[PDB]
Design a protein around this ligand. Structure first.
Ligand SMILES: [Zn+2]
Ligand SMILES: [Zn+2]
Ligand SMILES: [Zn+2]
Lengths: 168, 168, 165
């Protein structure tokens, strides 16, 4: 569930969805309508992590932060399956593609897209409305704004209404 | 070992399948006979169905999900390597998705084909039967011998169902 | 912690094993080591060794194939969501987050595998060197990473004061 490390307690909005098997630990803030999915890990100890309103952190993703590099997810952000966002700033409407890695100090602009499996080097800026892909990542072109966040606001509310464990 | 019902979608898991501790099979999922879903793996079907074929192993930390119009359909004797992501794609009989790889919506992995470890298979890419695809992004490179992971995991799963116990 | 047949993990009392981590089978976990949330350390057909003071971070995966033991040396860091498979990682080294290290590969002393890099089977990363790319390429000498001392201290803090809310 939700874990207090020493005296650091996650602050989770009651409309947020924390899936079974997800771990929210320590200095973490999870906003209204946010969702953290199965097997995801959100840990804030040496530095804080913010999951803005309506931001979804999909299955197997990992959020963490280093001193001086807080992990700040803006509102209506999507962190795809198995992505790692570490000490970076992701602004409103952006998408971190599934399997991608965003490193410390990187900055994902509004409605920007980090391609699947791309590795964003430390400090790199992804401008607003642009697609960055590759290993290492590189700004390629303008890209249409992702629509994953409204999908996951609604999918999360359905999960909050009808999720039941069943034994076999 | 438990499984998760989303709305009216309960996973249909064959009795000979092995579902490991820490694995999360959610919603519209079929898990075939002799299949195995290993520790920390997530197989989630809600927006669209997901099928784990018979004798198919979904290894540790792997993530399966499907998008509208893109079912995630794993054929028989398929291997999804450690920490891979197969999203809304078709994987034909005997193929291998290398560990850490990502396979995106609409991709098709031909029979006995191999996705290289860490490779990212773009949406809609077709990997022909018996071929090898690797790189970021993935490219079909050469013909490769059929992998033999699925038989070994059928047997390893059977050993786990008989002698896996929690300790202190 | 899970036993597989006759294979029981041997975990030192000072090691931190976070909730949601899965240590399975023929696994050694040394003094002052830590296995964090969602990580999977599985040893069945071959042995895995997590050396003293070595941290296996969140969602990382360790496994081994016959003849390829996964041997993590002391003071080693396996970053978030990394995969180290049947490889040898020497003292002080760093496997960057999201990276993949495959069978028979050797990560030299204080070497660094960059984040998301894929070290092919059998490849050697020499001591004090950085490897990047997919596949991996030895790029330049790098200063010793300092993650292992920080995580030794963080793990002892987590062993003492971690409670579900
Ligand atoms: Zn970290
Ligand atoms: Zn998805
Ligand atoms: Zn393996």
């Amino acid at each position: 569930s939700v874990y207090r490390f020493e005296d650091k307690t996650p602050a989770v909005h009651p409309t947020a969805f924390i899936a079974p098997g997800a771990y929210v630990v320590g200095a973490v803030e999870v906003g209204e309508g946010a969702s953290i999915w199965f097997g995801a890990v959100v840990r804030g100890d040496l530095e804080r992590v913010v999951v803005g309103p309506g931001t979804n952190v999909q299955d197997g993703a990992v959020l963490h932060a280093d001193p001086g590099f807080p992990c700040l997810l803006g509102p209506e952000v999507t962190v795809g399956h198995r992505a790692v966002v570490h000490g970076a700033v992701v602004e409103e409407g952006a998408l971190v593609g599934m399997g991608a890695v965003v490193l410390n100090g990187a900055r994902i602009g509004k409605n920007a897209v980090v391609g699947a499996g791309a590795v964003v080097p430390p400090g790199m800026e992804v401008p607003e409305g642009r697609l960055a892909l590759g290993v290492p990542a590189r700004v390629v072109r303008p890209i249409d704004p992702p629509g994953n966040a409204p999908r996951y606001r609604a999918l999360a509310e359905r999960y909050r209404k009808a999720l039941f464990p069943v034994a076999t």
